[PDB]
Design a protein around this ligand. Structure first.
Ligand SMILES: O=c1ccn([C@@H]2O[C@H](COP(=O)(O)O)[C@@H](O)[C@H]2O)c(=O)[nH]1
Ligand SMILES: O=c1ccn([C@@H]2O[C@H](COP(=O)(O)O)[C@@H](O)[C@H]2O)c(=O)[nH]1
Ligand SMILES: O=c1ccn([C@@H]2O[C@H](COP(=O)(O)O)[C@@H](O)[C@H]2O)c(=O)[nH]1
Ligand SMILES: O=c1ccn([C@@H]2O[C@H](COP(=O)(O)O)[C@@H](O)[C@H]2O)c(=O)[nH]1
Ligand SMILES: O=c1ccn([C@@H]2O[C@H](COP(=O)(O)O)[C@@H](O)[C@H]2O)c(=O)[nH]1
Lengths: 345, 345, 345, 345, 345
């Protein structure tokens, strides 16, 4: 292993591919350059808190197959990955602080069977040879596979996965994984869970007829068709832009509908991958704004199921919803048997 | 006050909100990070010339209500703000070098009544309690209010204001201010003035029928309808792209019309907020370019009034137009009683 | 806890003392400044690989009582300290990567009784209340005390200790500790050991009559008086400067004698605290030099005991000597029953 | 003015001398280089908080004649210098944040007669032509001269001054100045004052017979000869190294006597020029140490006068002594009519 | 070749030694670290203008045998070295900008026989096999050897050379070289030359009886013994400290004599190796100072020969003296047949 060999692979293979060779490398400030035909070409700018030459090596060795989105791994308590780097593209940094068998500066072990790895919840990838059996022996672990594992009940994960920073539902490649988890040598039954949909504002695409209806129909028409009167969708989902403080607007599909008609600014003041996102939102059309607007991307059909499964008889309470394998707390406010607002915290 | 408490407020409230608490903070190079669930998340990248921890505190304490655009405050001679930070989003830096009662590293005073503040033109905000009366006592000051001030004649400011970096005409919030100014204890009569419209190229929206006509009609049709023959609109407003040096094109609406049909590059080589902007422009379609193209965004109706109020009998002269409370100099070139060009300097 | 409060303590108490207060702080590049009467004064320059604000906090909280030299702790396998920072003054950095109950960015636990601390060999300091009993309960640990511990046999440590970076034999303060060690809940019997003396070239002071004799007597006289003929002291201790490659010179006292008569340069190319030190040495008088000259500071009486306890009948072999609780390997070369050279590796 | 012209003067004249010319300059990180015969030579490393090219210009234009030590100017309330830079060699930075007529980035005025300079206490140097008369007209100012000023009573300053960072009593050049001060146009009578002597530990030289006696005589002999029994010189001046906490040792001459016999470490944790200095002291011989040891360098004859002019009848009190034109507070502790300790704060 | 292999050699061999291996390396800012037993140890701090990883490689590959001082190579017009790095310890940087066969980022050729090397004056080292014959074939070159070269007349170089930054007259190693030079394929006759002695102030040691006499005798006694009256040694060599501007003092031995009696400060404002050095000198005893004091270190016997070989009949003139193979210009000032001053420029 060598910095110059890593650069050679990046230049010739697009990432670290284990090829032999070296190229000349310059490091100046926080950027790595290589000399290409007499001129310097930037290969990598370190945006991490690691040393530039270390971040470069971890970046070059990132996993380039579809992998679980980082929010899923965090929610499952994954501490470290077995013999790979999960690159966190939202943070432009490794998803995990340490490595196993990846890099001499960051390795805590060469193999996940060493004792130092035993207390950590290690992520194992059943697509790599041998890792399923390592999971059967590991004390703490999470395993994904594309198919069945003998003697283990799977929990079916989300349909989408991350490929080189692109979140997608795979058609030429499988992105739908079974999930398994062990704690202290004991296989866990992962809970029934909803999954977030991981869409974004500018390219929001509906994924069900109900979501199509939400984008196509007027507000009162949609709530009428699906008999959603009294659940405060006008506030919660569509948003209330009538006052200086922006009311509601907590579901991504609701932001998408407003955005497609009228633009607004979202300051992502904690920029990481998480099931619930908090934005400093400023509506450009009205001047309505809100410092902390919590936003979750559930499939609209799923959100309706959740809200229709709540008792509306109490002024305020916390509602727990298992999402992405974690319990998300929602604030439910009601008045006279109707929803006033309902937002994730 | 404390760096870690500022970070706590940013993480939990989107900005500094006076809440008690602390979170762990890392500073590496010119970026501030906080540790969130075992990983570092970037909270702020310093693009200012202040120390990173100082810029972070001023940024977190920026004013998040609608405030006058920085170009107005500069034109009014404002030196410093009373108990707030005006963040200059065009420069990504504070609009003013010093503060009053904001930050221990940058404070020159805790209250604007101290003698050190007397010679400075201090900006007071009548929406904050007590500040109107501070203005009545201050030696040098500018005061904005949303309504009347007893015994003071107001100057009506622009319709738009800046909210979290978004320039807008408020509908749910008031952005139209009265302006007052004192110099050496004496209230000034602010001059009659036009106002720039603060629009941008990509999202340019007409704001009058004349501007609608400009975008909808052909060049000769528009000049004919409003009887503008001989005022060189073909050159000044529409632009002349026939030669290697780009001719004219000095009004934003004229750039907008060309841009909507044909893209071009504008290098903003002095990136700050100012009434007149200078761009290094390169027309992609023709290759016509100009190193310094001065561009002003007046409402088209206002620009027509201005140019029709000039004598066209002289080869060249400087025309003074009060705009944004400042005197803008225009170059007027005429030949045989017609305009040849007319551009701001 | 807060950066500004740490700076307040540094300015007012010389280190972190738990006092309430704050001062204004600036961070620019890798240096921390505070404003003192209108000007900036540097408080700390980060020479560590930690973030500047983190290194500053660990530095301010360094232990300022006599503590074991870092080489002893390393040799004893200490991984982390209980509720203190051992500052490594040779590296100008913390001696240990993590902390317990010191600093939010670096803490792995608030108390050493947490499970995450169990596999680490934690250093406990019996001078601090409660820590002896924590040692009795800890799974892995090293404990120093100034006196007896009930039911535990002590190993008497070196006479000297480090106080604010000053290695000294205490007269007004106790620097002589008893040592105890536990591995997996079992108290260890620490081995019989020599100790290095931790002296330096420029201020080398003899500590026994034999060392006095070495500095005072001529080479042949000293070897004769203590009947050291055939042990190659002429080479090993005095040094051989007759060839382009410097021969021998492996004991600090031998460097001291040459240095007091004739100066030379020692490049400390791995600058850390360790029992054996390696120097790139250049003799200024002769031009004799050697890239790797291993140097150990044993009391001369101790080194004579060691070398007189070796068999000299073999051409070459590795000799193991327990020093500072670790086994130091020496290379022993002999010819015709006499030493040729003998140096630590 | 130009960066490259400044570098030309530095290379050819040792400082800025107003010569015409330019040399090639490179700025990389915080260091300025120039190319000299094909290689880069470092000219200046910025240790200030100013921009590297700005600090370089102020450094090159530093005053290279004898000037008052910075501690005197600070004590006199000087805010800024007229047409010069006082370089603060203890901080390796300008003594004053702003300049007058020195540097375009830092100038607040070109001449001290401008209104912006009126509220500042401006330092004027009577050796420069015209500055005495500027002082007669300035509202706030301090003036030094080498001789009489018509109609103004002088206060005789210290014998020593700073020349290129060297504090000296001039023999070939005059370092003894008259001082004058104006506040709001009114000449002040500067108070009777002692002066500190500005000596250092390693090169401490006695400057009176009493100081000679202190270094030459034994402790009891000296106190006896000058009849100083009961004034706790044994504690205050000689120092008490018998306990873990170092007792007393508050006069530089007392540190000098110990240091000449036995070395110790002084951590200067607030590194600036000031009348009273605070050190984190560790005595190497005994291990006695103290986190905050306040140290003042008075001429011993002066300190005896001060302490013999105090009432010793009270347990504890604050004693005010005018020194370097400022009031220094001393803590006086007495028991049964004798001094227990007496130290500056 | 590889960064990590270079670090391995540095850690294990003190410099680059061609050994196989790798160690983990971190680069942060301008410093290279390696992890040694769980902690980071600084290996190299870049003070050059090259990229940190490039400077590190050139530093590790520096020549560690005695080599000509850089001032000699510069004076001989050497542009580049054949298959080695001459490290310039005065500048802490490579003596030459480019390399031949050393480092991929800096190499301009792998062998000096390539056409790109033909116009450069390449330094060849006859101690390395094959390089003498390369010199016979090179178009432009300088060759040093320890002995005779067939068919070439040598010029005997200085007695001293640089070994790892230590300038010395070798006793165990040869530092006295023959010099040869070729320009456009033609061997040059190097001129008769004096050599500077390369001594320093603090450790100045006389090297002849005349120099011994200078240090031992009083000023008038020495000038009398060697009949030097009228050559202004009182001014030129001893220095004149009677006025605010320091007079004379242009020979290092003269600085040494003053320094041994009385200290002064020398600011080396162009820090590089050169035959003539310019210092900003401040005399601590008198306050006499001079911004540009040119200082040359000739053996006193040599300087007397030079000055006694000048005509003293003219007010002022430039005197050319071949020194270190270059022509040094001296200013000679005379009055009434005696020297007034005589200093190098
Ligand atoms: O985690 C949070 C906290 C607040 N809010 C929004 O901020 C306001 C909180 O009001 P209050 O409960 O502080 O009165 C509401 O508009 C709510 O939608 C969120 O979206 N998420
Ligand atoms: O402040 C300026 C200066 C120049 N120009 C443009 O640059 C050219 C100036 O020509 P001249 O007056 O230098 O000949 C014209 O095309 C004019 O529109 C501007 O827009 N603004
Ligand atoms: O760890 C080491 C390795 C080598 N040397 C010195 O370097 C030389 C090693 O020679 P060799 O055994 O490589 O032939 C000897 O002078 C020896 O003293 C040391 O001091 N320490
Ligand atoms: O400004 C200060 C404060 C304390 N000390 C020293 O620190 C100790 C203060 O003790 P106490 O008054 O806090 O008990 C004494 O040894 C005293 O000499 C100083 O020198 N200067
Ligand atoms: O290259 C130089 C230039 C000047 N000086 C010194 O500076 C002064 C130059 O005076 P002047 O010839 O500028 O009058 C003299 O003291 C002279 O010794 C040098 O040493 N070297």
């Amino acid at each position: 292993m060598s910095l110059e060999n890593v650069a050679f692979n990046v230049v010739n293979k697009g990432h670290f591919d284990g090829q032999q060779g070296e190229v000349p490398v310059s490091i100046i400030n926080n950027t790595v350059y290589t000399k290409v035909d007499g001129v310097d070409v930037e290969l990598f700018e370190n945006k991490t808190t690691l040393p530039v030459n270390v971040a470069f090596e971890l970046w070059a060795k990132r996993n380039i197959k579809p992998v679980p989105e980082v929010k899923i791994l965090n929610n499952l308590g994954v501490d470290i990955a077995a013999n790979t780097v999960i690159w966190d593209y939202k943070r432009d940094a490794p998803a995990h602080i340490s490595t196993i068998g990846v890099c001499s500066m960051t390795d805590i072990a060469k193999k996940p069977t060493e004792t130092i790895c035993a207390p950590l919840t290690v992520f194992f990838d059943g697509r790599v040879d041998g890792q399923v059996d390592l999971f059967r022996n590991a004390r703490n672990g999470v395993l994904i596979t594309e198919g069945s594992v003998k003697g283990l009940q799977p929990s079916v994960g989300p349909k989408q996965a991350s490929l080189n920073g692109v979140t997608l539902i795979g058609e030429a490649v499988k992105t739908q994984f079974n999930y398994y988890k062990k704690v202290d040598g004991v296989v866990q039954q992962l809970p029934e869970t909803y999954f977030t949909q991981s869409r974004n504002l500018q390219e929001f695409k509906p994924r069900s007829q109900m979501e199509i209806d939400f984008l196509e129909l007027a507000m009162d028409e949609f709530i009428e068709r699906y008999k959603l009167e009294g659940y405060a969708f006008e506030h919660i989902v569509y948003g209330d832009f009538s006052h200086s403080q922006l009311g509601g607007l907590h579901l991504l599909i609701g932001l998408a509908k407003r955005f497609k008609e009228s633009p607004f600014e979202l300051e992502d003041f904690i920029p990481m991958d998480s099931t619930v996102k908090n934005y400093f939102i400023t509506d450009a059309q009205t001047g309505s704004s809100k410092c902390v607007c919590s936003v979750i991307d559930l499939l609209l059909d799923d959100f309706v199921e959740i809200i229709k499964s709540q008792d509306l008889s109490v002024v305020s309470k916390v509602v727990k919803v298992t999402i992405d394998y974690t319990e998300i707390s929602f604030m439910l406010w009601c008045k006279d048997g109707h929803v006033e607002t309902f937002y994730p915290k």
